[PDB]
């Protein structure tokens, strides 16, 4: 049960500075080096640097020294990384990875997240349109177009539906998301009984329930 | 520019041995690089398997081993498991900083091959009434997890206003993904044919609709 808990995600405006966290539990915090990695889909991974919890001894990747500041609070066993003067380029997932020294060298445990989004875009409610066929028996759908910023919650028939439902990840065109969720049903329920997706966008305090109709 | 490189993707079956390799651009990968191998499973779950060229991180199954082959670092997985399907990352130490590879997306054929289940949705009139059109093409139940989606308007390949998601693992372990085609209501009213082409394991599937 060695654990590295990290906030799932944080939203911040370009030009600001965030302070990400990595709570450690399970092992003696000060006898393991801690590292910070940055990942952006398409790019792969980049090493930011490492801090030595016992000394506070720090070591950076030159490309990140005037942008990141690593530190730790021994009593609470958590590690921090403060990113400054945020830009688009700094939108990414930032991992904290525990490091093993001597006997040998190990990068054993990893925290799991914290995707950071740096955008100067205002909240935007989604638009929900019913996806019906033109023409496991019939597939239906809900298009959740143009909302900002993540996440969104899609449910089908308030939970009454468990199978066939496939919510997809969001795409980002024009600094604006969009996704869709699908649910397949026996040609019997449709149009006999009817399906209704339950889109919810927390940031915009919006909830739209749409029933899918014939076409 | 000291870049590190790896195999984009490799495929193996349950029980077989497979080797992943790591190139150093400076030259031979040596012990002084302390090769580190990291595993990334679905939904960003990372775990380091081998550190320091061949030290197995405690708690890691014995079927994982590291070494040097030629002038490259290697990750040997013997007796390939189904859970072992994941992408593997390589990390080298160059004096004062680490450098990763692009990662090798490893496929362990732990289930039968299944072609994509494609569905093409036309533009809803509600969206149409806002002067914008969107075709949605859901692609489910395919394995392995790689497909190539192509859109075609009037039989002609279109490559603008197109967004395809990266395949995502389903409940039953198969892969699903979605693609989109957005146009102005106007643009949509002049063409007659619209089709979502999905290519999987050399077999191509299409779903068309005529406005």
């Amino acid at each position: 049960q060695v654990q590295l808990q990290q906030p799932g995600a944080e939203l911040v405006k370009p030009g600001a500075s965030v302070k990400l966290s990595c709570k450690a539990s399970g092992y003696t915090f000060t006898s393991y080096w801690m590292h910070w990695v940055k990942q952006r889909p398409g790019r792969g991974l980049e090493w930011i640097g490492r801090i030595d919890p016992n000394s506070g001894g720090t070591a950076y990747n030159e490309k990140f020294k005037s942008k990141a500041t690593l530190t730790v609070d021994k009593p609470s066993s958590t590690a921090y990384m403060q990113l400054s003067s945020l830009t688009s380029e700094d939108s990414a997932v930032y991992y904290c990875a525990r490091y093993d020294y001597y006997g040998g060298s190990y990068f054993d445990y990893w925290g799991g997240q914290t995707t950071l989004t740096v955008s100067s875009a205002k909240t935007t409610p989604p638009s929900v349109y019913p996806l019906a066929p033109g023409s496991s028996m019939v597939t239906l759908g809900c298009l959740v177009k143009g909302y900002f910023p993540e996440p969104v919650t899609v449910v089908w028939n308030s939970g009454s539906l468990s199978s066939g439902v496939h919510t997809f990840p969001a795409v980002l065109q024009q600094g604006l998301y969009t996704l869709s969720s699908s649910v397949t049903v026996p040609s019997s329920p449709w149009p006999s009984e009817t399906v209704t997706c339950n889109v919810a966008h927390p940031a915009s305090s919006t909830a739209v329930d749409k029933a899918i109709v014939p076409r | 520019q000291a870049v590190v490189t790896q195999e984009s993707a490799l495929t193996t079956s349950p029980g077989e041995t497979v080797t992943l390799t790591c190139r150093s651009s400076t030259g031979a990968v040596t012990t002084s690089n302390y090769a580190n191998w990291v595993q990334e499973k679905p939904d960003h779950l990372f775990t380091g398997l081998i550190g320091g060229t061949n030290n197995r991180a405690p708690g890691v199954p014995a079927r994982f081993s590291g070494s040097l082959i030629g002038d490259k670092a290697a990750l040997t997985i013997t007796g390939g498991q189904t859970e072992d399907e994941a992408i593997y990352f390589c990390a080298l130490w160059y004096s004062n900083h680490w450098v990763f590879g692009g990662g090798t997306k490893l496929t362990v054929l732990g289930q039968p091959k299944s072609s994509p289940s494609v569905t093409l949705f036309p533009p809803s009139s509600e969206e149409l009434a806002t002067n914008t059109a969107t075709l949605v093409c859901t692609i489910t139940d395919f394995y392995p997890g790689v497909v190539t989606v192509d859109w075609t308007v009037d039989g002609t390949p279109v490559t603008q206003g197109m967004e395809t998601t990266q395949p995502s693992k389903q409940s039953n372990n198969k892969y699903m993904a979605s693609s989109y085609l957005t146009l102005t209501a106007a643009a949509w009213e002049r063409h007659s044919s619209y089709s979502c082409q999905v290519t999987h394991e050399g077999h191509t599937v299409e779903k068309s609709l005529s406005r």
Binding site: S55, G56, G57, T58, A59, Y60 | -
Partner: peptide, 10 residues
């Protein structure tokens, strides 16, 4: 250049 001691802040 690192991998310890002489370096806290770099």
């Amino acid at each position: 250049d690192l991998w310890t001691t002489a370096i806290p802040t770099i």
